[PDB]
């Protein structure tokens, strides 16, 4: 997250760190959202590589013992069947991870609430991106979980020629684009939390930013629109 602030450690209890095994260590690669005690929602592109993955819930500082973490293996990966890694602009950037164990819920570990199917946010709706991704274009991962305020940019604006044009689909949410705040590498897969009727819900799965840079004016961060995938999510969990 570029232009973020450090989150409070109990603000975003559905955020997870998706990590892969790297020698005798683990490396953070992506975010995700805990949606059942044994299921995480992330981006498909986060799991294109043939890596060994784990999920960390209750994580605040990637580099320090928080005293709240639970570490759990990924048992099964179900990528959306229309996903193509060489066509991120086509959409379908979503995957579900079945965890090897059910995590225990507490003030640091909670299920993310998803919107009702079909819900579309008004332009300029209040949202936060969260993650441990780079804090500058071509920078380094955050140590502590970051948040940034990224108001939505509706489809008509986002898909206009000075924004993303044809690259953005109605199956996506755009947010931000102010040139200061954005998602960045290592945020992919994580949530966009939007305040609706007094409740935050996870409306987005972080999918991409511009090849030119993370915080680029009129290139808002692009997310998979969770409300387009409710039936798919429910069907995968019910069949697995
Ligand atoms: Ca930690």
Swiss-Prot record:
Disulphide bridges: 30-46, 127-194, 158-174, 184-214
Molecular function per GO: metal ion binding; serine-type endopeptidase activity
Active site: 45, 93, 188
One GO term (biological process): proteolysis
Cellular component terms per the entry's GO annotation: extracellular space
Residues of the Peptidase S1 domain: 1-238
Keyword Endoplasmic reticulum: no
Cofactor binding description: Binds 1 Ca(2+) ion per subunit.
Similarity section: Belongs to the peptidase S1 family. Elastase subfamily.
Name the record gives this protein: Chymotrypsin-like elastase family member 1
């Amino acid at each position: 997250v570029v232009g973020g602030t450090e989150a409070q450690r109990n603000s975003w209890p559905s955020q997870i760190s998706l990590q892969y095994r790297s020698g005798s260590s683990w490396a953070h690669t992506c975010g995700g959202t805990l949606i059942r005690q044994n299921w995480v929602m992330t981006a498909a592109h986060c799991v294109d590589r043939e890596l060994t993955f784990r999920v960390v819930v209750g994580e605040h500082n990637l580099n320090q013992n928080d005293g709240t973490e639970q570490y759990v293996g990924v048992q099964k990966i179900v990528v959306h069947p229309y996903w193509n890694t060489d066509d991120v602009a086509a959409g379908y950037d979503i995957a579900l991870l079945r965890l090897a164990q059910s995590v225990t819920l507490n003030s640091y570990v909670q299920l993310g609430v998803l919107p009702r199917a079909g819900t579309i946010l008004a332009n300029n709706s209040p949202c936060y991106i969260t993650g441990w991704g780079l804090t500058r274009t071509n920078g380094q991962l955050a140590q502590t979980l970051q948040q940034a305020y990224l108001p939505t940019v509706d489809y008509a604006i986002c898909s206009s020629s000075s924004y993303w044009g044809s690259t953005v689909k109605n199956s996506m949410v755009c947010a931000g684009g102010d040139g200061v705040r954005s998602g960045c590498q290592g945020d992919s897969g994580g949530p966009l939390h939007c305040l609706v009727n007094g409740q935050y819900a996870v409306h987005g799965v972080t999918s991409f930013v511009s090849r030119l840079g993370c915080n680029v004016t009129r290139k808002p961060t692009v997310f998979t629109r969770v409300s387009a995938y409710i039936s798919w999510i429910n069907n995968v969990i019910a069949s697995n």
